[PDB]
C-alpha cells in the first residue's frame, strides 16, 4: 500500500484476519506493520485547513495566516514546519501568537481596542490594515 | 539463429518511430498533396495536421521560431502559422454572431 | 493565495488555499520478514504437468 | 471608496468568467486540451471516447458555472427586493419604519 | 464474408486498421458489430509445389 | 460546538466546520442591550438618543 | 494520501477550487445574515438593575 | 546493431510514405501508440527518431 | 481509473453544493423575515396585521 502522509501511534484493535482499516470507506485510517504487529493510523501529510486573511495586493504584500481549529502550541507540528521554506517557518510561530476559538493567527498584532470591521475572521475576531503599518487582529 | 528453429526464435527486426504530434514546425510528412488556400471563407483547412472547420483572417501576431502553433486560452488554436508562406493566419470558427 | 486565485494581484478578505507547501523527499518500504524464495523454478521446469 | 457593493458585484462577474475560461484551459485527462489536435490524431473508435471526456469535462465546468450564478442571482434578488421595497416605501411616500 | 489470406494480415484483417489487405483488399467500418473468424489452413489450401 | 478537535476533521476527509462570525455570548450582549433599550427608552432607541 | 498529488490538483483542482469560493461566499453571507438580524442597531445600553 | 546498443536516427526533411513499404515486407506487428494507423496519413510531425 | 473515482467524487461534492443552495435560500428567507420583524415590532410599533 503506497501513498504520502504522515502515521501516529493507533488505539485501535485489529481482528487477526483484519490487516487495513477504514473507517469510511474512501482512505485507508490505519495499518498494521508488517514486522512490529503494533497498529499505526495514517493522516494525511498536509492538513489544518490554513486561510490567509489579506488586504489588496494594490495595497501591501504582507499577509497573515489562520490555522483552522488547531491550538496555537501545536502549530509546528500540524503543519510540519521543518520540511517547509525558511519563509513559512516565519508563519509558524513568532512574537504575535493570537489564539482564537476558530483557530490560531499567525502574522497579526493584537490589540484590546475594538473597531468596526471589514475581514469576518470568525469567533469574535475580526481584521483590518491599519495601526508602521500592520494587519491588527 | 539458426533457420531451423521456431517461430519463437526467428529473428524479428524491429524499426521504432518516435515522433511529437504538433508542437513544433513539422519536416516531415505523409503524401497527401497541398492545395490552394482560401482565405477570410468558411472551409475545411488542414495546417501541417491540424484539421478543422472555420473562417481565417489576416493576424498581426508574433511568433517565435521555435512556436507553429498558438494558443490564447488552450483549448482552441487561436493562430497558425502557414507551412508555405511564412505570414501568420488566426483562425476563427466558421459560424458565430450569436443570432 | 495567488497559485489557488490564479491570479497575481488578490483583493482584501479570507482566502482559502489548497496545500502547495510540502512535498515528500524520502521514501521508507516496509514489507514482512521473508527470506525463502518461492519454487517458481521447481514448478516451471516439472516434468509433467 | 465606499461603494463596495457595486464594484463586489463586478468583481465577482470578473472572477466567475475568468476561473471559466481557465476552467476550459484545461485538458481533462486527455492526450490534448485542444480538440483539433484529438480530433486530428485518433480515428474515431477512440477518438470519440477522447472528445467525450473533453466534452463531459467542459460541460461540467459550464454547470459549475450555472451554479455559482445561482448564488450570484439569489443575492441579487434579495438585495433587489430589498431596494424595490426602500423605493416604495420611502421616496414614494414617508415611512414609519424604524430604521 | 469469406476468403483467404497469409499468416501477417489476420491483424489487418480488423477495424481501424491499416496495411495492403486493409486499403486495397477488404476494408472493415469503424462502426463494425460483428466476429472474425479466422484458422490456419496449411493442409488443404497449400498443396505440394 | 467550537470545541471540536481536528481529528473530527481528518474523520470528516477534509470538511471543516468553522466557527461562526458572532459569539454566542456576543449575541446575548446584542439581546440584552436591544431589551434594555426598548424597555427603557422605547421607539426612541432606534433614533439615537 | 495520494503518492501523486501534484498532477492530481493541476488536473482537477480548479473545480474544487470554486466549489470551494462557493462555500466560502455561504458562510460569508450566513454571516452577514447574523449580523443583519442582530445589529440593527450598534448601541449597547448596560441592563439596568 | 543489438538490442543492448540500439541505433537512433533522426529521420527529417523528407516525406513519410509508407505505402511503398508494403512491396517490400509484410509486418508482423503494427501497433501505433497516442496516433492512429488509419490517421497517420492526414498528421505532420515535429521530431522523427527512429 | 483514477479521472473516473475523481470524478464520482467531484460529482458527490457538486450535489452537496446543490443541496446547501436550497438550505441557503430557505435560511436567508427565514432569516430576511426575521430582520423584517427586527426592524419592525421591537424597535416600534407595527401596524401589519397578523
Ligand atoms: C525482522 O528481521 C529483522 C532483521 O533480523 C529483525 O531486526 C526484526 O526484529 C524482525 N522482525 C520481527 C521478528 O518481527
Ligand atoms: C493601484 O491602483 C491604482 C489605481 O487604482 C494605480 O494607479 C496604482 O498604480 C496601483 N498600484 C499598484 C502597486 O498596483
Ligand atoms: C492549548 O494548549 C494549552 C497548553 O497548556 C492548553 O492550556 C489549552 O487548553 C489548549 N487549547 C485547546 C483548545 O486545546
Ligand atoms: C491588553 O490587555 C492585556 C490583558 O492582560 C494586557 O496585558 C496588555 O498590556 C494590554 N495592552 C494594551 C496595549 O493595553
Ligand atoms: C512551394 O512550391 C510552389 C510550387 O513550386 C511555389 O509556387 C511556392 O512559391 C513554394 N513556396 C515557398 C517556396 O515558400
Ligand atoms: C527445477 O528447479 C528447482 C529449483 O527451483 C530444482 O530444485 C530442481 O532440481 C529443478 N528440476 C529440474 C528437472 O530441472
Given at each position: 500500500?503506497?501513498?504520502?502522509?504522515?502515521?501516529?501511534?493507533?488505539?485501535?484493535?485489529?481482528?487477526?484476519?483484519?490487516?487495513?482499516?477504514?473507517?469510511?470507506?474512501?482512505?485507508?485510517?490505519?495499518?498494521?506493520?508488517?514486522?512490529?504487529?503494533?497498529?499505526?493510523?495514517?493522516?494525511?501529510?498536509?492538513?489544518?485547513?490554513?486561510?490567509?486573511?489579506?488586504?489588496?495586493?494594490?495595497?501591501?504584500?504582507?499577509?497573515?495566516?489562520?490555522?483552522?481549529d488547531?491550538?496555537?502550541?501545536?502549530?509546528?507540528?500540524?503543519?510540519?514546519?521543518?520540511?517547509?521554506?525558511?519563509?513559512?517557518?516565519?508563519?509558524?510561530?513568532?512574537?504575535?501568537?493570537?489564539?482564537?476559538?476558530?483557530?490560531?493567527?499567525?502574522?497579526?498584532?493584537?490589540?484590546?481596542?475594538?473597531?468596526?470591521c471589514?475581514?469576518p475572521?470568525?469567533?469574535?475576531?475580526?481584521?483590518?490594515?491599519?495601526?508602521?503599518?500592520?494587519?491588527?487582529? | 539463429?539458426?533457420?531451423?528453429?521456431?517461430?519463437?526464435?526467428?529473428?524479428?527486426?524491429?524499426?521504432?518511430?518516435?515522433?511529437?504530434?504538433?508542437?513544433?514546425?513539422?519536416?516531415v510528412?505523409?503524401?497527401?498533396?497541398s492545395?490552394?488556400?482560401?482565405?477570410?471563407?468558411?472551409?475545411?483547412?488542414?495546417?501541417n495536421?491540424?484539421?478543422?472547420?472555420?473562417?481565417?483572417?489576416?493576424?498581426?501576431?508574433?511568433?517565435?521560431?521555435?512556436?507553429?502553433?498558438?494558443?490564447?486560452?488552450?483549448?482552441?488554436?487561436?493562430?497558425?502559422?502557414?507551412?508555405?508562406?511564412?505570414?501568420?493566419?488566426?483562425?476563427?470558427?466558421?459560424?458565430?454572431?450569436?443570432? | 493565495?495567488?497559485?489557488?486565485?490564479?491570479?497575481?494581484?488578490?483583493?482584501?478578505?479570507?482566502?482559502?488555499?489548497?496545500?502547495?507547501?510540502?512535498?515528500?523527499?524520502?521514501?521508507?518500504?516496509?514489507?514482512?520478514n521473508?527470506?525463502?524464495?518461492?519454487?517458481?523454478?521447481?514448478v516451471?521446469?516439472?516434468?509433467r504437468? | 471608496?465606499?461603494?463596495?457593493?457595486?464594484?463586489?458585484?463586478?468583481?465577482?462577474?470578473?472572477?466567475?468568467?475568468?476561473?471559466?475560461?481557465?476552467?476550459?484551459?484545461?485538458?481533462?485527462?486527455?492526450?490534448?486540451?485542444?480538440?483539433?489536435d484529438?480530433?486530428?490524431?485518433?480515428?474515431?473508435?477512440?477518438?470519440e471516447?477522447?472528445?467525450?471526456?473533453?466534452?463531459?469535462?467542459?460541460?461540467?465546468?459550464?454547470?459549475?458555472?450555472?451554479?455559482?450564478?445561482?448564488?450570484?442571482?439569489?443575492?441579487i434578488?434579495?438585495?433587489?427586493?430589498?431596494?424595490?421595497?426602500?423605493?416604495?416605501?420611502?421616496?414614494?411616500?414617508?415611512?414609519?419604519?424604524?430604521? | 464474408?469469406?476468403?483467404?489470406?497469409?499468416?501477417?494480415?489476420?491483424?489487418?484483417?480488423?477495424?481501424?486498421?491499416?496495411?495492403?489487405?486493409?486499403?486495397?483488399?477488404?476494408?472493415?467500418?469503424?462502426?463494425?458489430?460483428?466476429?472474425?473468424?479466422?484458422?490456419?489452413?496449411?493442409?488443404?489450401?497449400?498443396?505440394?509445389? | 460546538?467550537?470545541?471540536?478537535?481536528?481529528?473530527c476533521?481528518?474523520?470528516?476527509?477534509?470538511?471543516?466546520?468553522?466557527?461562526?462570525?458572532?459569539?454566542?455570548?456576543?449575541?446575548?450582549?446584542?439581546?440584552?442591550?436591544?431589551?434594555?433599550?426598548?424597555?427603557?427608552?422605547?421607539?426612541?432607541?432606534?433614533?439615537?438618543? | 494520501?495520494?503518492?501523486?498529488?501534484?498532477?492530481?490538483?493541476?488536473?482537477?483542482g480548479?473545480?474544487?477550487?470554486?466549489?470551494?469560493?462557493?462555500?466560502?461566499?455561504?458562510?460569508?453571507?450566513?454571516?452577514?445574515?447574523?449580523?443583519?438580524v442582530?445589529?440593527?442597531?450598534?448601541?449597547?445600553?448596560?441592563?439596568?438593575? | 546493431?543489438?538490442?543492448?546498443?540500439?541505433?537512433?536516427?533522426?529521420?527529417?526533411?523528407?516525406?513519410?510514405?509508407?505505402?511503398?513499404?508494403?512491396?517490400?515486407?509484410?509486418?508482423?506487428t503494427?501497433?501505433?501508440?497516442?496516433?492512429?494507423?488509419?490517421?497517420?496519413?492526414?498528421?505532420?510531425?515535429?521530431?522523427?527518431?527512429?
Amino acid at each position: 500500500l503506497t501513498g504520502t502522509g504522515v502515521l501516529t501511534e493507533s488505539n485501535k484493535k485489529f481482528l487477526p484476519f483484519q490487516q487495513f482499516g477504514r473507517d469510511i470507506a474512501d482512505t485507508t485510517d490505519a495499518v498494521r506493520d508488517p514486522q512490529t504487529l503494533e497498529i499505526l493510523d495514517i493522516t494525511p501529510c498536509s492538513f489544518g485547513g490554513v486561510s490567509v486573511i489579506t488586504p489588496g495586493t494594490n495595497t501591501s504584500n504582507q499577509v497573515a495566516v489562520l490555522y483552522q481549529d488547531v491550538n496555537c502550541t501545536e502549530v509546528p507540528v500540524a503543519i510540519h514546519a521543518d520540511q517547509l521554506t525558511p519563509t513559512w517557518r516565519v508563519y509558524s510561530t513568532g512574537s504575535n501568537v493570537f489564539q482564537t476559538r476558530a483557530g490560531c493567527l499567525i502574522g497579526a498584532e493584537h490589540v484590546n481596542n475594538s473597531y468596526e470591521c471589514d475581514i469576518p475572521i470568525g469567533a469574535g475576531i475580526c481584521a483590518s490594515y491599519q495601526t508602521s503599518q500592520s494587519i491588527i487582529a | 539463429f539458426q533457420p531451423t528453429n521456431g517461430v519463437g526464435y526467428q529473428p524479428y527486426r524491429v524499426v521504432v518511430l518516435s515522433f511529437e504530434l504538433l508542437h513544433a514546425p513539422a519536416t516531415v510528412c505523409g503524401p497527401k498533396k497541398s492545395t490552394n488556400l482560401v482565405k477570410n471563407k468558411c472551409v475545411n483547412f488542414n495546417f501541417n495536421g491540424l484539421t478543422g472547420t472555420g473562417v481565417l483572417t489576416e493576424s498581426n501576431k508574433k511568433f517565435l521560431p521555435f512556436q507553429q502553433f498558438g494558443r490564447d486560452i488552450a483549448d482552441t488554436t487561436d493562430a497558425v502559422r502557414d507551412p508555405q508562406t511564412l505570414e501568420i493566419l488566426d483562425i476563427t470558427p466558421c459560424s458565430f454572431g450569436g443570432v | 493565495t495567488k497559485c489557488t486565485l490564479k491570479s497575481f494581484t488578490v483583493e482584501k478578505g479570507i482566502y482559502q488555499t489548497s496545500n502547495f507547501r510540502v512535498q515528500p523527499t524520502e521514501s521508507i518500504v516496509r514489507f514482512p520478514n521473508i527470506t525463502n524464495l518461492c519454487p517458481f523454478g521447481e514448478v516451471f521446469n516439472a516434468t509433467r504437468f | 471608496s465606499a461603494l463596495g457593493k457595486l464594484q463586489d458585484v463586478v468583481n465577482q462577474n470578473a472572477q466567475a468568467l475568468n476561473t471559466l475560461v481557465k476552467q476550459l484551459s484545461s485538458n481533462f485527462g486527455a492526450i490534448s486540451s485542444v480538440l483539433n489536435d484529438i480530433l486530428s490524431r485518433l480515428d474515431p473508435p477512440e477518438a470519440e471516447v477522447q472528445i467525450d471526456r473533453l466534452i463531459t469535462g467542459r460541460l461540467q465546468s459550464l454547470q459549475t458555472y450555472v451554479t455559482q450564478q445561482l448564488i450570484r442571482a439569489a443575492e441579487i434578488r434579495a438585495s433587489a427586493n430589498l431596494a424595490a421595497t426602500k423605493m416604495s416605501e420611502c421616496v414614494l411616500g414617508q415611512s414609519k419604519r424604524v430604521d | 464474408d469469406s476468403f483467404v489470406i497469409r499468416g501477417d494480415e489476420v491483424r489487418q484483417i480488423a477495424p481501424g486498421q491499416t496495411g495492403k489487405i486493409a486499403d486495397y483488399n477488404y476494408k472493415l467500418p469503424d462502426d463494425f458489430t460483428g466476429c472474425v473468424i479466422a484458422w490456419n489452413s496449411n493442409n488443404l489450401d497449400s498443396k505440394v509445389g | 460546538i467550537a470545541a471540536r478537535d481536528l481529528i473530527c476533521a481528518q474523520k470528516f476527509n477534509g470538511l471543516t466546520v468553522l466557527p461562526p462570525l458572532l459569539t454566542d455570548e456576543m449575541i446575548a450582549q446584542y439581546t440584552s442591550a436591544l431589551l434594555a433599550g426598548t424597555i427603557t427608552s422605547g421607539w426612541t432607541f432606534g433614533a439615537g438618543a | 494520501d495520494s503518492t501523486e498529488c501534484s498532477n492530481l490538483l493541476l488536473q482537477y483542482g480548479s473545480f474544487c477550487t470554486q466549489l470551494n469560493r462557493a462555500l466560502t461566499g455561504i458562510a460569508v453571507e450566513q454571516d452577514k445574515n447574523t449580523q443583519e438580524v442582530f445589529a440593527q442597531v450598534k448601541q449597547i445600553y448596560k441592563t439596568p438593575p | 546493431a543489438s538490442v543492448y546498443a540500439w541505433n537512433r536516427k533522426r529521420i527529417s526533411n523528407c516525406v513519410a510514405d509508407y505505402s511503398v513499404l508494403y512491396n517490400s515486407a509484410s509486418f508482423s506487428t503494427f501497433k501505433c501508440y497516442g496516433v492512429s494507423p488509419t490517421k497517420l496519413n492526414d498528421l505532420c510531425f515535429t521530431n522523427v527518431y527512429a
